Task: structure prediction
Amino acid sequence: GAQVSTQKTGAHEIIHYTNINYYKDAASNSANRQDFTQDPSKFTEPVKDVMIKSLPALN
Amino acid sequence: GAQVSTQKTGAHEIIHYTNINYYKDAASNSANRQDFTQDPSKFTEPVKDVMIKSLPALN
Amino acid sequence: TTDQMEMFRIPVTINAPLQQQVFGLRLQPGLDSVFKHTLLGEILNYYAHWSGSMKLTFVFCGSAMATGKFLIAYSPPGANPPKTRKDAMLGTHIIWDIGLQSSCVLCVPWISQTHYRLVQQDEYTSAGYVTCWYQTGMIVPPGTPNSSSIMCFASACNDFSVRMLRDTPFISQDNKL
Amino acid sequence: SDRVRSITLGNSTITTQECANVVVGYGRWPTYLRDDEATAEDQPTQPDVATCRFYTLDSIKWEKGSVGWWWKFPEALSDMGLFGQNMQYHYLGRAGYTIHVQCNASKFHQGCLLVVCVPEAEMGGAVVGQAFSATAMANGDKAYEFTSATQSDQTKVQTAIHNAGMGVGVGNLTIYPHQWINLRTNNSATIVMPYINSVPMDNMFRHYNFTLMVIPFVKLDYADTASTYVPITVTVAPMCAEYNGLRLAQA
Amino acid sequence: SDRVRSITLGNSTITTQECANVVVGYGRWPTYLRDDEATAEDQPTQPDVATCRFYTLDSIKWEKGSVGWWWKFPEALSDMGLFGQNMQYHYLGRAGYTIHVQCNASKFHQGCLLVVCVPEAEMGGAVVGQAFSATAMANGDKAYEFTSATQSDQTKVQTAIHNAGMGVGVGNLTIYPHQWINLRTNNSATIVMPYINSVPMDNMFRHYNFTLMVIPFVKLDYADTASTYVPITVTVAPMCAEYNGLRLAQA
Amino acid sequence: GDVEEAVVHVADTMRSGPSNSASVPALTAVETGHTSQVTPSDTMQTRHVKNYHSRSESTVENFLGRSACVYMEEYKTTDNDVNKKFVAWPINTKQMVQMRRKLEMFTYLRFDMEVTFVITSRQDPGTTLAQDMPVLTHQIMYVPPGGPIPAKVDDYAWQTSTNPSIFWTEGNAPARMSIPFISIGNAYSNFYDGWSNFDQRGSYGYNTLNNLGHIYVRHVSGSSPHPITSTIRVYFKPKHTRAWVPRPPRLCQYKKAFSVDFTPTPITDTRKDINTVT
Amino acid sequence: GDVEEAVVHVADTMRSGPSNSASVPALTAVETGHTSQVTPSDTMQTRHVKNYHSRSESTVENFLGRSACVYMEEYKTTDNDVNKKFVAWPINTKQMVQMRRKLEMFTYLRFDMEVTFVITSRQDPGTTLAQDMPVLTHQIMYVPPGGPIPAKVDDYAWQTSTNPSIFWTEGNAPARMSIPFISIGNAYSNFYDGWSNFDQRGSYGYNTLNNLGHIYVRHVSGSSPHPITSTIRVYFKPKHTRAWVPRPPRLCQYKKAFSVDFTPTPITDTRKDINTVT
Ligand SMILES: CN1CCN(Cc2ccc(NCc3ccc(F)cc3)cc2)CC1
Ligand SMILES: CN1CCN(Cc2ccc(NCc3ccc(F)cc3)cc2)CC1
Ligand SMILES: CCCCCCCCCCCCCC(=O)O
Ligand SMILES: CCCCCCCCCCCCCC(=O)O
Result:
């Protein structure tokens, strides 16, 4: 029950680490700071009708 | 001789932990607080003849 | 109450002014004095959060020849508790008819804005009120007592639950026993 | 046993332990208006558990000298819960009703009551050729009392009990949907009245759909008891109610 | 042409001929509460066309010296149609809103307005460490005016426009859902705000879901015309409204 | 087999509509001693709700699985009174009120025990306090029933050869260990409605069944020029627990450590009248 | 299965050449409330660039994943005033300005908590300082809402049987633990635009929703001949975090711990004129 995953590194320079949980409560686990998904559409494009950048904004 | 089992978590949010026993006496093990079986019939329905909720209690 | 046992009996009489209140209480199972020391309040007092529905069962302990009808209503939280039967009827209620079956059950539904409520209830987590009113009145034949009594039973449904184990405040000591 | 009935509408429940069967109008259960019978064009509102619920009207006293009482609907419920608000704010309405009457007494009492719903119970004034206002026959949920003698005041309806204020024999009211409350074997009566009218919908402030009458055919009697009167209570619950034509609220 | 939009809710319709696009909250359309997220046990009422309809609030005057206005909901609609009655008679509520603001002027006028909905717009009092009643920030549908100078009266909220009564830069309100009314190319703004809260339902008399603010960033100006002011009107329409916990009506 | 792989939720509401029939779930009879199983769906219209709440925290294992103080006591490193330089405590769980009430909610219990000891020291006030003393050490001794009992700090009995003991030095973590189920019977009994002699005479109550032993504590060899006082706290933590025959929680305040004696108490508090709700 | 195996980069510039057409990406209309998505490639000639920068450090988890002080407090081992010998802090995150502002950038939050306690002691000045005292010990007690509250250092409530507690000795590592999501609602709320009573009266603001409990600290049994003062610092570290509805950062200085009250402040600093750039 050991999880092996890559660790942060650079662009062109064994980049693996092992983790095991010792407690029965999920609140005792370490921070899951390895998620990098994001989507700014909710705040940048809240309009109803999709607008194309190339075409005029209105008409 | 390592036991892998799930740990407590929420409804819609690796939820695994490992345990090993180091002592030869079962009294030294950790609390087994992961059992959630219950049956209130012994105290709520101690009658001999089964009574249906829908039908009248008597006659 | 000079006699402690009198606390368990709700008085009733014949020739009752029409549409009178029988009793009224606040729904705080863990804080109100009525539910404080009950078999349920004692359990809740060891916790901080609670949720689920409750059951109130009323049993008529009058004469066999006596008869009557009662209205029992539950009023969700509001700015004012009901003061008349017309106000009370608007909320959840059940019409109780006294007959061969001497007991009726009022199931209090779980209506709340939060998944849980504090045992040390406050204005934010208020729960409402429960009241009982005369529906038709009690009628008895000749040669029977002019008064009767009613008893109430409290328990939890199958969807009840508690959380956050705390230490109860009902028991304390000043010196080592 | 078939002598116990329970009725559940909305967030209210009615339980009776000594009741007769249930009378269902003319054999027709209440239902919503069909598409091929409607005339209004806009979508109808359908407040469900909010309007469809039991509403207990004020209770009355039954003495040895009582003659009877009547109520007119929906003017009786015109100021009751959200039902009254919906009536006030809407031009058209439509709903069936379930009527429950409670009356209990010991085994040593005797008496009989007739419970009947009279659709289109038009009434004539005490003095023939003199009009009456809309107050001698409906003033909210309060009950109006019949009279044993002939009415003489010109400002109110003819309350002759034996004529029932309709110029017909009181004993012939059995034709309408009805039930009897006999203290020997019954405490309550239940009637389910569907929507009856010549049009799919109508204004509930201008038109009285039907009238409820309670007449003691056998006068109450008792001896050597501390109970001096037998209260009577009436409960009503609209069914399958829908409205149309929203507008400013009628004063 | 995409500059013309029509909106139809219930028995009311809104038509605009010079409008920008429509902003939809945080990209989430209003919807009914799901079964797996509900907590209350009893059936919810769902008045549909009765509560879900456009309701026009009182109109305001825009002068050269205006500073801005704000409204708090649903206290603004607390006394409007059947929506107010349903709020009064129920303990819990839930509904999304559609906000439409109208402002039209000739091609020779200049000015710009910011329309923004601020959820949980908690405000601080004029004198730090002194409470205010529930009247300096909401008294029905009437609009409350910001102030250019610092507020001094202790019985009302701090109305400093540049701080917006929240201790934050007024220019950073762009983060919330918003729209601009530029007299050059726009007359109206439309915003669709879903239900946002930390609980599935809440009382609509105790909690202000969100606040609507209108701030003129570019002050109105004109020359040699008979029009002295530019009225502004606000229209709101609840969407997918449902209630629960019926009780006596809150005074 | 280097690895060996080893969600209960409260009931869900179901949708209910209008009903009109002879069935009367609301009506019952408490005379049978049977608690009604009615649900809100049986007396009013309800929506479908999926409830994810769980009763995990209400299990007896978690309820009793908390360490609680059961005994305190003070002993001095040096003093004229011999009996004041060490402690001798007969083991019992009736000394502290909170744990006593928590345990007394059940008639019979069966569990393992986890004991933790917290020891602190302080230097006694005086006219001359200047001194230098290395770290102190303490010995905890357990004497099962019938074994020899020391009579002084430097008695021969402190040479335990079979009696378990722990030596602990200040500044480290508190001492800890485990104790199995050591009852002669099949389960511990919090109450005993009986006597000691066969002719119904002698000791009465749970005092007759308390034969767990004693605990002794002393300073190993510390003897300061000036007095130093130390305090020890004992904490019990049931594990792998089982309970039978629940009983109502106590209402009256405790007054004796080995008896149920009490003073009559009102059932609950009062209010203006039966209708007061404000 | 003894093992179970478990690189996002910012956008890259693309080569752009001369253009002459009717398309006008540079022209838009802010009136729609829509932020333009134009890129430098759309308004000038650009080369092809591969960018390896990542936004890993900008995630909310990392932004809020730092321990910050939230409360300090001092208590003496011995003194005449009973209330001065222990601490009683109602839990709240509005006491320290930095963490308050960091948290207040979002309207709703949901996270686990990691609490660390730092305790230090110092001997009070006086005319006579010579004394010898062993290592001190401290107890940290947490009382959920509605539980009993101690009124003195040696009160009975310090015998916690259900309330969690920690005993710590000076010289070791700071105490640490985890706390789950303990809100009655579905998420913590930093702001609450509402009242407590249903008639719009009573408490106003986020003070109505603060029902987290209290924390108590004391010296276990230390009582020196001369006063000794100790200080405790509490550090909070959100974990497994989620946020909703971002709001602009605060501009005015804080003035109350349970209110949004403020004083009007200028938007920003000034300069000689609109053209000054030096
Ligand atoms: C009559 N009472 C019944 C309940 N029983 C509770 C109880 C159970 C076990 C212990 N163990 C104390 C102990 C003994 C030796 C040791 F090394 C560690 C702990 C105490 C009480 C008390 C009697
Ligand atoms: C109304 N405010 C909303 C934000 N909320 C932040 C917050 C969340 C959790 C805690 N936990 C304190 C704590 C309690 C017990 C324990 F053992 C450890 C830590 C505090 C603040 C504050 C209220
Ligand atoms: C309480 C857990 C203690 C774990 C001690 C270190 C791991 C020992 C076992 C070797 C790793 C294998 C774990 C696994 O089977 O997933
Ligand atoms: C006294 C036991 C010490 C155990 C030390 C950690 C475990 C080392 C072995 C790796 C885990 C495999 C155990 C197993 O075979 O079940």
